[PDB]
């Protein structure tokens, strides 16, 4: 049974196994893709190719990641413009962003963006956002408009422990987050 | 304690090529703020 | 930093989580580092870094490898050089073929050059292998002059388990081979 | 079931640098002999 997996405590300014892209770093111990400040765009990828189906039996793999994360907006009022989780192409570089995220392009279903992301989405987008304007966790898969979308209350500097998995079988993704409090 | 989440079906075989990259993706734009992972699991397995 | 672990049960065509070097390409089922074809050497790298210990702390990683090899040989009589696993700083090209396995360059403790490796030794180099010159494997390390052997029949065209293990605890390396039989 | 066995003293520590690569050679010179490896697996605890 072909299988893989890591885990990583805690992070350090050398890290051979990742691969920054745009503002990313690591700190002495935080990953922080973008500091309190206006149009960047922070990514980290694990260096390691993973294989998720195999064209030869064609099955789908069950996987499970894991990650607590802070965001701190030094305005209470002010933030955007979100965090992004995302699968990709082996080779993917960065994308347009501030609320695209750095991950997608256009609005509209694109094939051609082999990926699929997780958001949560600090904030509101009329063009494309949920109407309501509500900050959101959400689904997205190959444009900015989230396949689905959560309501959610972010709470800012709170560690905020998250899983995301994806049944094979059921072939269904999800998504929790939670906090302390 | 309070807590999200959401589901969904989403057929990665049908949409992502054989093998991948994982990361996150961040940004600020006219606004802005700190993000930043504190720590990152991750397995897989394939049948 | 904390737990990295795969496992890969069959090699496929392409493998993007592996770097070769030299005549190492994946075929369709194994890996094959070498060709029944006078002076090569082949080499493939687990790509994935993998932080084998850390200075922030001290502490040393132990790990346990597996796999199955084979050696064949179209004449039992006139075969070498051997196989070898090895660990290697990051970015190790093909050292000294022949005797020197792709790993080494000296009969020497050459610190520089910072690698340890396993071998499964199948040519007698009078110049340094045990005198006896019985097959063996050996642990090595900054040599290709192993700190230690065991003598060792080898079977051509048949597969060896091997499972490799360092206790962090104790600095101890032990390999061990088996034969169905 | 002939089997071999083999183990040793290594200060890994002190020969190695914190991060590594795994992996294996094989080599033929004057003589020579095909080598393939089969099936792989690696796994290691840093606690
Ligand atoms: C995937 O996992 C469980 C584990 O038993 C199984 O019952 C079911 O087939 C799947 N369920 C999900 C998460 O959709
Ligand atoms: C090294 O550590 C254990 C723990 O008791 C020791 O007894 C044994 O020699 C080795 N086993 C491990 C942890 O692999
Ligand atoms: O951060 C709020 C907004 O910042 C910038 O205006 C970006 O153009 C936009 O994508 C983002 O939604
Ligand atoms: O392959 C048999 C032998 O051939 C040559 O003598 C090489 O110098 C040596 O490395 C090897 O052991
Ligand atoms: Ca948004
Ligand atoms: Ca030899
Ligand atoms: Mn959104
Ligand atoms: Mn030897």
Same mark, same amino acid.
């Given at each position: 049974?072909?299988?893989?997996?890591?885990?990583?405590?805690?992070?350090?300014?050398?890290?051979?196994?990742?691969?920054?892209?745009?503002?990313?770093?690591?700190?002495?111990?935080?990953?922080?893709?973008?500091?309190?400040?206006?149009?960047?765009?922070?990514?980290? &990828?694990?260096? &390691?190719?993973?294989?998720?189906?195999?064209?030869?039996?064609?099955?789908?793999?069950?996987?499970?990641? !894991?990650?607590?994360?802070?965001?701190?907006?030094?305005?209470?009022?002010?933030?955007?413009?979100?965090?992004?989780?995302?699968?990709?192409?082996?080779?993917?570089?960065?994308? !347009?962003?501030?609320?695209?995220?750095?991950?997608?392009?256009?609005?509209?279903?694109?094939?051609?963006?082999?990926?699929?992301?997780?958001?949560?989405?600090?904030?509101?987008?009329?063009?494309?956002?949920?109407?309501?304007?509500?900050?959101?966790?959400?689904?997205?898969?190959?444009?900015?408009?989230?396949?689905?979308?959560?309501?959610?209350?972010?709470?800012?500097?709170?560690?905020?422990?998250?899983?995301?998995?994806?049944?094979?079988? !059921?072939?269904?993704?999800?998504?929790?987050?939670?906090?302390?409090? | 304690?309070?807590?999200?989440?959401?589901?969904?079906?989403?057929?990665?075989?049908?949409?992502?090529? *054989?093998?991948?990259?994982?990361?996150?993706?961040?940004?600020?734009?006219? *606004?802005?703020?700190?993000?930043?992972?504190?720590?990152?699991?991750?397995?897989?397995?394939?049948?």
């Amino acid at each position: 049974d072909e299988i893989t997996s890591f885990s990583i405590p805690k992070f350090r300014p050398d890290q051979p196994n990742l691969i920054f892209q745009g503002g990313g770093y690591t700190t002495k111990e935080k990953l922080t893709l973008t500091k309190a400040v206006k149009n960047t765009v922070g990514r980290a &990828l694990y260096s &390691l190719p993973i294989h998720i189906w195999d064209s030869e039996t064609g099955n789908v793999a069950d996987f499970t990641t !894991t990650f607590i994360f802070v965001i701190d907006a030094p305005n209470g009022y002010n933030v955007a413009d979100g965090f992004t989780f995302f699968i990709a192409p082996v080779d993917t570089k960065p994308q !347009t962003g501030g609320g695209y995220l750095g991950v997608f392009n256009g609005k509209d279903y694109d094939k051609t963006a082999q990926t699929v992301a997780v958001e949560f989405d600090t904030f509101y987008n009329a063009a494309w956002d949920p109407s309501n304007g509500k900050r959101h966790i959400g689904i997205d898969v190959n444009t900015i408009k989230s396949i689905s979308t959560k309501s959610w209350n972010l709470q800012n500097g709170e560690e905020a422990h998250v899983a995301i998995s994806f049944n094979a079988t !059921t072939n269904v993704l999800s998504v929790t987050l939670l906090y302390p409090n | 304690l309070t807590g999200y989440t959401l589901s969904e079906v989403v057929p990665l075989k049908d949409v992502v090529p *054989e093998w991948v990259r994982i990361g996150f993706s961040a940004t600020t734009g006219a *606004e802005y703020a700190t993000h930043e992972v504190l720590s990152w699991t991750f397995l897989s397995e394939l049948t």
